[PDB]
Amino acid sequence: RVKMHVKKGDTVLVASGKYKGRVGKVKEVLPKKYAVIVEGVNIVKKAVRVSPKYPQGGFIEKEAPLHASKVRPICPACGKPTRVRKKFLENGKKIRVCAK
Amino acid sequence: TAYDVILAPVLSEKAYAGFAEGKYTFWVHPKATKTEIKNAVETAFKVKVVKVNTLHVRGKKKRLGRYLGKRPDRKKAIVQVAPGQKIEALEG
Amino acid sequence: SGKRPIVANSIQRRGKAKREGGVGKKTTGISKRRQYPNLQKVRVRVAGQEITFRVAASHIPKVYELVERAKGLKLEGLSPKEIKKELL
RNA sequence: GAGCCGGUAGCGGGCGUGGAUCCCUGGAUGUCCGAAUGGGGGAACCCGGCCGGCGGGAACGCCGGUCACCGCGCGCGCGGGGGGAACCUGGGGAACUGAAACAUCUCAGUACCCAGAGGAGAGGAAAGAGAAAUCGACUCCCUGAGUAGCGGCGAGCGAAAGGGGACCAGCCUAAACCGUCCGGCUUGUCCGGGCGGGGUCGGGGGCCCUCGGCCGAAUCCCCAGCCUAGCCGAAGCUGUUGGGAAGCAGCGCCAGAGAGGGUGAAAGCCCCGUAGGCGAAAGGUGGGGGGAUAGGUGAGGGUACCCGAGUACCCCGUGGUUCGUGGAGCCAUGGGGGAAUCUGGGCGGACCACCGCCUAAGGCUAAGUACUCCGGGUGACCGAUAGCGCACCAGUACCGUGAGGGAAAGGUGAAAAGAACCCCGGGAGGGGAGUGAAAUAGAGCCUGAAACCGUGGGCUUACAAGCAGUCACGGCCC
RNA sequence: CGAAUGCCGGCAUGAGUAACGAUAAAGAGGGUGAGAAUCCCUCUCGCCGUAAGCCCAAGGGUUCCUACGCAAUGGUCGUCAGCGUAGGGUUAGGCGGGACCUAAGGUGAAGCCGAAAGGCGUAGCCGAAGGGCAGCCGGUUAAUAUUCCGGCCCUUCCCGCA
RNA sequence: CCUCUAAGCACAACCUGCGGGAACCCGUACCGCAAACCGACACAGGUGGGCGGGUGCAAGAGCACUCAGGCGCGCGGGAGA
Ligand SMILES: [Mg+2]
Ligand SMILES: [Mg+2]
Ligand SMILES: [Mg+2]
Ligand SMILES: [Mg+2]
Ligand SMILES: [Mg+2]
Ligand SMILES: [Mg+2]
Ligand SMILES: [Mg+2]
Ligand SMILES: [Mg+2]
Ligand SMILES: [Mg+2]
Ligand SMILES: [Mg+2]
Ligand SMILES: [Mg+2]
Ligand SMILES: [Mg+2]
Ligand SMILES: [Mg+2]
Ligand SMILES: [Mg+2]
Ligand SMILES: [Mg+2]
Ligand SMILES: [Mg+2]
Ligand SMILES: [Mg+2]
Ligand SMILES: [Mg+2]
Ligand SMILES: [Mg+2]
Ligand SMILES: [Mg+2]
Ligand SMILES: [Mg+2]
Ligand SMILES: [Mg+2]
Ligand SMILES: [Mg+2]
Ligand SMILES: [Mg+2]
Ligand SMILES: [Mg+2]
Ligand SMILES: [Mg+2]
Ligand SMILES: [Mg+2]
Ligand SMILES: [Mg+2]
Ligand SMILES: [Mg+2]
Ligand SMILES: [Mg+2]
Ligand SMILES: [Mg+2]
Ligand SMILES: [Mg+2]
Ligand SMILES: [Mg+2]
Ligand SMILES: [Mg+2]
Ligand SMILES: [Mg+2]
Ligand SMILES: [Mg+2]
Ligand SMILES: [Mg+2]
Ligand SMILES: [Mg+2]
Ligand SMILES: [Mg+2]
Ligand SMILES: [Mg+2]
Ligand SMILES: [Mg+2]
Ligand SMILES: [Mg+2]
Ligand SMILES: [Mg+2]
Ligand SMILES: [Mg+2]
Ligand SMILES: [Mg+2]
Ligand SMILES: [Mg+2]
Ligand SMILES: [Mg+2]
Ligand SMILES: [Mg+2]
Ligand SMILES: [Mg+2]
Ligand SMILES: [Mg+2]
Ligand SMILES: [Mg+2]
Ligand SMILES: [Mg+2]
Ligand SMILES: [Mg+2]
Ligand SMILES: [Mg+2]
Ligand SMILES: [Mg+2]
Ligand SMILES: [Mg+2]
Ligand SMILES: [Mg+2]
Ligand SMILES: [Mg+2]
Ligand SMILES: [Mg+2]
Ligand SMILES: [Mg+2]
Ligand SMILES: [Mg+2]
Ligand SMILES: [Mg+2]
Ligand SMILES: [Mg+2]
Ligand SMILES: [Mg+2]
Ligand SMILES: [Mg+2]
Ligand SMILES: [Mg+2]
Ligand SMILES: [Mg+2]
Ligand SMILES: [Mg+2]
Ligand SMILES: [Mg+2]
Ligand SMILES: [Mg+2]
Ligand SMILES: [Mg+2]
Ligand SMILES: [Mg+2]
Ligand SMILES: [Mg+2]
Ligand SMILES: [Mg+2]
Ligand SMILES: [Mg+2]
Ligand SMILES: [Mg+2]
Ligand SMILES: [Mg+2]
Ligand SMILES: [Mg+2]
Ligand SMILES: [Mg+2]
Ligand SMILES: [Mg+2]
Ligand SMILES: [Mg+2]
Ligand SMILES: [Mg+2]
Ligand SMILES: [Mg+2]
Ligand SMILES: [Mg+2]
Ligand SMILES: [Mg+2]
Ligand SMILES: [Mg+2]
Ligand SMILES: [Mg+2]
Ligand SMILES: [Mg+2]
Ligand SMILES: [Mg+2]
Ligand SMILES: [Mg+2]
Ligand SMILES: [Mg+2]
Ligand SMILES: [Mg+2]
Ligand SMILES: [Mg+2]
Ligand SMILES: [Mg+2]
Ligand SMILES: [Mg+2]
Ligand SMILES: [Mg+2]
Ligand SMILES: [Mg+2]
Ligand SMILES: [Mg+2]
Ligand SMILES: [Mg+2]
Ligand SMILES: [Mg+2]
Ligand SMILES: [Mg+2]
Ligand SMILES: [Mg+2]
Ligand SMILES: [Mg+2]
Ligand SMILES: [Mg+2]
Ligand SMILES: [Mg+2]
Ligand SMILES: [Mg+2]
Ligand SMILES: [Mg+2]
Ligand SMILES: [Mg+2]
Ligand SMILES: [Mg+2]
Ligand SMILES: [Mg+2]
Ligand SMILES: [Mg+2]
Ligand SMILES: [Mg+2]
Ligand SMILES: [Mg+2]
C-alpha cells in the first residue's frame, strides 16, 4: 500500500550518514519499519542468544535496518530515481535516464 | 465430521495409566460432544469401544486476560480387553 | 376504548371557571385538568351468525348498513374481518 | 508486483516475479445466543417431532433440511416481527423554573415514554389565503416582526398575509353509467359484492345525433458519471562543522507539482506525496443524458342523473392557530340533534344581507430542508488534568444487587545497537566493560520544575521571647 | 491563581507514634536455605471436641495438587502460602438435575380490556433442596472417586425366542 | 403406579421370563460456620441441612475433661511504672 517504496533485493548506494555514499549489494527489504538492512550500519549486538548455543567467541555481529529514504538505487548511473515504463503489458523500473 | 471430533490426546501421567485398563483420554470437540463418540473413536482407530466417560476441564490464566485456551471436554475409551492398540505407547 | 368503525378517543382539558362571564361582568378560568373523554361505546350484537362489535353508538346505523349485506361467503366461525374490510 | 505467514519478538516451520502477502468486489461456510422463530429457557444452554444420511445401529447418538406468531390474497403462497448516534410525524406528556409568592399562565406541546417510517420524515394540490376586477400545491431560509395580536392585558408568549429565494409536478379513486358474476329472491327486464370500462372546478362528469383527435411519466429497462481497490506522476550533486545534513557555501534543475509528512536535524529536486491525468472485470449507484411503455389529446345544446354521510351544519365539551370565553370565526372532534349534490355546500373573524373566494367528509405525490453512528477533507480547534469518558487492550479495571456510575494510565533512542563478559549480591539492584552523539537517554526510560527528603560545605545558634521580618551597625567564608 | 470546608495528582505533618485484628500458649532439637520465632520433621506443652472435627447443599470459581520462584499480597519475616509461573487434576444407566410430574408464582393459545407500551386470563406449558425414579461396600495416585477398579445387586428402553 | 373401556388394533398391541443389545446432556476439584461464601481486609460479625464419640454431675445438643480429627487464632522479645 503506502508501504511500497524505492526498490527490492538488488545493489544500491546509501547516502545517509557515516556511510554517505556506499554501494552495497542485495538489500533485504524490511519494510514495515521502512528500512532495508543493506550493507551500511554494522553495529554490534551485545547479545548472547535466546537459545543458549555455541557461546561467545568474537562479535562480528550483524547489521541494522537503515531507514529506506536514503538508499539511492543504482544502474549504469549513480542515484537517479526510479520510474515506471509499462510497454503495454508490464511495469518496469527505469531510472532517470540511462536504462534498465 | 468424524475426525473433527477427537481433537487430540493428552500426554499426562494419569493417561499413561489408561493403558493398563482403559484406553487414553482424548480432548474431544467440546460441543457436538456426545458420549457416543464411540463411533468417533472406533471409526478412527478401528477398535471396539465398550465404555466412554466425559468431562469439562481447563480454566483460567493470567497475562492480561483469562481462560487458558479453551474449556475442552476430554475423556476416553474403556475399549474391549486388548483391542487396545494403535501405536499410542510412544512417550508412555 | 376502541374504534371499531371510527377513530379512537381523544384527550380534553377541563377548564373550570368561577365568574360572571363577559355578557354580565368580569370572567375567569380556574384549573385546566385532563378530562379523558372516552368515546361512546356500545357492544352491539348482530346476526351475521353471532357477531359482536364495539361500535360507537353514533355509528349503530352504520353497522346495520354493514349488516344489510350479503358478501357471498359462509362461516369460518368468527368472520368480522370480511365484514370490516368490505367496509367503505 | 516482491515480500510474506495480523498487532510476531521468540518453535525455528514453511510460502512467493509460472505472482503470492495484501486491498476491493462477488459468492461459499457461518457453531450457539439474540426479533429467536420447533417447545422450554435462568441468553450464548437444554428437549423435540417429521423427512433424508453414518452392528456407527431397532432402541440413545450426530449430520443436513423443515417445524414460531401475525398480516394479505387462492391446505397454498408474498410480506411483517427486532435494531439504529441523532433527524421527523403521530399518540400521551410533566415539573422545577419565570411570574421576584402562586393557582390561570410560563417553562412547553420542551424533556421523556410509546408507535411508525425512511435516508429522510412531515405536508401537499385548495371547501386555501384575504382585499387586490389579487395570489395560485406543499416544504425550507430571509424579511414581514417582536408586528398584528394574545396576556392574572402581569410574566411573558407571538403569528399570518404580502415580498424576496430555493425548488419546481401533478395525479389515481363510487369530481352516476355500461356490460361481468358466487348468490339475493316475492325468478325482480332487478338488491349489494368483487373486478373491468368509464369518470377528476369537438364548474366537472355519465347519458342524447353533426363537428375525429397522440402529449408524456413519479414507472421500466439503458448510458455516462459517481463510488467501492488503485495507478502514472517533473527536477541536486559536490565541499563543509558534524554522531547525523536537507543546515552553510558553490554550481544547477523542475514547477498545471514551493500543500504536508517523514528522512539521524533546517529537503521543491531522497521517499511518500501534491498539480495534472489515467483506472473497474464485479457490485452498488444514478433520466444528469437520450428510449418506450401505463396514463392523458342534460367543442357544443339540452330531459334538473352523480359529484365521497351519521359527514357538513347547530348545540354541549375541548385541543390547534397570535386567540387564555373574548365580539370567537376558522381547522380538528369526544357527546347529542341532524341535512341536501350546483337556484347544492363551505369560507371571507359573532351574525345577518350584497360582493367575492373555493369545493370538505377518499388516497398518492419527487424536489428543495433537519440530522451525523459513518467515510473524506477542512481548522486565528485541544496537545495527555486538554480533546471524547477512553490518543494506551475503555465504557475496561474498580464501585453498585440493579438501573447505572466509572477512572487513571502517551513519549528510550536515529537505530534496540534494549547492555555480551566480569565483580559484589540469593536475587533485585548496583560498579566496571560495552553501545550510543548523549546511558544523571538504561527500560512503564525525552525535558524532568516545585512541595518533600537527604548528603557535603560556608555563616550561625544551648540566659533566651517570636506574624519570625525589616532597618541599622559589628563579626566571619566566599 | 492563593484562598472557593475548591478539583486532580504528588509529598509532608501527625510519627517511627497508635496499632498488628481475640488474655486458646508456646518451648526445644535436627534439617532445608544465602537468609529463619514464622517453612518441614521430631518430642513435649496448650485449645475445641453440639466444634475451632467430619459430610452435603448455597455461594465462590481452579483457590485443588505437584514442581520452579518470592518483587508484589500475607499487618512482622518467609525458603512457606491459598501469592507469581508452568504442568496436571473434576470420569456416573444406579448420586444430583434435564430427555418425568406438579404447588405458590410466572408465561399463556382461546377470550377480555386497555391511546400505545401493555394489564388480565381458560386450557396448556414452565416452575422445586416437594412427589417419582435404578446402589452398596472396599482399594488406588499428587489431586477425583456411590463416577475409576473389585465383588454383589438393580433399573429403564430396543430386538429375538418361548 | 394399579385398573376400565373409547377411539384403533384385533397378522397387532401389551404382559411374564430367557437370550442378546443400547443407556444420552449438565454437575462432580477445592473451601464450605470459613483465610476460598456474604461483610473493600487472610475482618472476633452472618450463614441452611446431617453425624457430632467417652466419663461424670438426676437428664441433656448443657457443663468439665478428653477420643478421632483439627488448630495455637501470620507479629514477636523484654520490663513488671
Ligand atoms: Mg498483471
Ligand atoms: Mg459427567
Ligand atoms: Mg490462579
Ligand atoms: Mg383570565
Ligand atoms: Mg398549567
Ligand atoms: Mg345491545
Ligand atoms: Mg502471525
Ligand atoms: Mg492473485
Ligand atoms: Mg493466494
Ligand atoms: Mg489476506
Ligand atoms: Mg457444511
Ligand atoms: Mg429457538
Ligand atoms: Mg418460548
Ligand atoms: Mg441452558
Ligand atoms: Mg452402511
Ligand atoms: Mg441403517
Ligand atoms: Mg430439527
Ligand atoms: Mg412480487
Ligand atoms: Mg419495528
Ligand atoms: Mg407550574
Ligand atoms: Mg414562580
Ligand atoms: Mg411560591
Ligand atoms: Mg404554548
Ligand atoms: Mg421525500
Ligand atoms: Mg401524505
Ligand atoms: Mg388545486
Ligand atoms: Mg416566518
Ligand atoms: Mg410567502
Ligand atoms: Mg411566496
Ligand atoms: Mg411544473
Ligand atoms: Mg351484484
Ligand atoms: Mg373508473
Ligand atoms: Mg349532441
Ligand atoms: Mg445505455
Ligand atoms: Mg464513460
Ligand atoms: Mg479506488
Ligand atoms: Mg511514481
Ligand atoms: Mg517523484
Ligand atoms: Mg555537528
Ligand atoms: Mg519539515
Ligand atoms: Mg533530534
Ligand atoms: Mg521536505
Ligand atoms: Mg492527478
Ligand atoms: Mg458495471
Ligand atoms: Mg458489467
Ligand atoms: Mg436508486
Ligand atoms: Mg366532492
Ligand atoms: Mg343519527
Ligand atoms: Mg362553520
Ligand atoms: Mg380583548
Ligand atoms: Mg346555484
Ligand atoms: Mg365547508
Ligand atoms: Mg375562502
Ligand atoms: Mg361558517
Ligand atoms: Mg366579513
Ligand atoms: Mg416523498
Ligand atoms: Mg432547501
Ligand atoms: Mg481522518
Ligand atoms: Mg496548542
Ligand atoms: Mg499540534
Ligand atoms: Mg494525560
Ligand atoms: Mg483525558
Ligand atoms: Mg505531561
Ligand atoms: Mg481500552
Ligand atoms: Mg459487583
Ligand atoms: Mg528516533
Ligand atoms: Mg545484573
Ligand atoms: Mg522517573
Ligand atoms: Mg528522564
Ligand atoms: Mg547541613
Ligand atoms: Mg539571666
Ligand atoms: Mg550564649
Ligand atoms: Mg519585642
Ligand atoms: Mg495551589
Ligand atoms: Mg476565601
Ligand atoms: Mg485571592
Ligand atoms: Mg489531596
Ligand atoms: Mg507522606
Ligand atoms: Mg504521642
Ligand atoms: Mg506510645
Ligand atoms: Mg503499641
Ligand atoms: Mg484455659
Ligand atoms: Mg479441653
Ligand atoms: Mg496448594
Ligand atoms: Mg520485596
Ligand atoms: Mg511481606
Ligand atoms: Mg530454595
Ligand atoms: Mg498457585
Ligand atoms: Mg447401572
Ligand atoms: Mg437418581
Ligand atoms: Mg436428548
Ligand atoms: Mg420437566
Ligand atoms: Mg397454576
Ligand atoms: Mg400476564
Ligand atoms: Mg405449549
Ligand atoms: Mg425434583
Ligand atoms: Mg427430590
Ligand atoms: Mg479430593
Ligand atoms: Mg468427587
Ligand atoms: Mg440390592
Ligand atoms: Mg448398549
Ligand atoms: Mg467430593
Ligand atoms: Mg453445617
Ligand atoms: Mg479455612
Ligand atoms: Mg469476602
Ligand atoms: Mg464493613
Ligand atoms: Mg488472620
Ligand atoms: Mg472470620
Ligand atoms: Mg444458624
Ligand atoms: Mg444435670
Ligand atoms: Mg460446650
Ligand atoms: Mg495475628
Ligand atoms: Mg500488669
Swiss-Prot record, chain A:
Keywords: Ribonucleoprotein, Ribosomal protein, RNA-binding, rRNA-binding. One of its GO terms (cellular component) is ribosome. PANTHER family: MITOCHONDRIAL RIBOSOMAL PROTEIN L24 (PTHR12903). It comes from Thermus thermophilus (strain ATCC 27634 / DSM 579 / HB8). GO terms for molecular function: rRNA binding; structural constituent of ribosome. Belongs to the universal ribosomal protein uL24 family. One of two assembly initiator proteins, it binds directly to the 5'-end of the 23S rRNA, where it nucleates assembly of the 50S subunit. One of the proteins that surrounds the polypeptide exit tunnel on the outside of the subunit. This is Large ribosomal subunit protein uL24.
Curated annotation (Swiss-Prot), chain B:
One of its GO terms (molecular function) is rRNA binding. Keywords: Ribonucleoprotein, Ribosomal protein, RNA-binding, rRNA-binding. It comes from the Bacteria. GO terms for biological process: translation. InterPro entries: Nucleotide-bd_a/b_plait_sf, Ribosomal_uL23-like, Ribosomal_uL23/eL15/eS24_sf. GO terms for cellular component: ribonucleoprotein complex; ribosome. It holds the Pfam family Ribosomal_L23. Belongs to the universal ribosomal protein uL23 family. Contacts protein L29, and trigger factor when it is bound to the ribosome. Part of the 50S ribosomal subunit. NCBIfam families: PRK05738.1-3, PRK05738.2-4, PRK05738.3-2. One of the early assembly proteins it binds 23S rRNA. One of the proteins that surrounds the polypeptide exit tunnel on the outside of the ribosome. Forms the main docking site for trigger factor binding to the ribosome. This is Large ribosomal subunit protein uL23.
Swiss-Prot record, chain C:
Coiled coil: none annotated. Keywords: Ribonucleoprotein, Ribosomal protein. GO terms for cellular component: ribonucleoprotein complex; ribosome. It comes from the Bacteria. GO terms for molecular function: structural constituent of ribosome. SUPFAM superfamilies: L28p-like. GO terms for biological process: translation. Part of the 50S ribosomal subunit. NCBIfam families: L28 (TIGR00009). Belongs to the bacterial ribosomal protein bL28 family. This is Large ribosomal subunit protein bL28. The lineage of its organism: Bacteria, Thermotogati, Deinococcota, Deinococci, Thermales. The gene is rpmB.
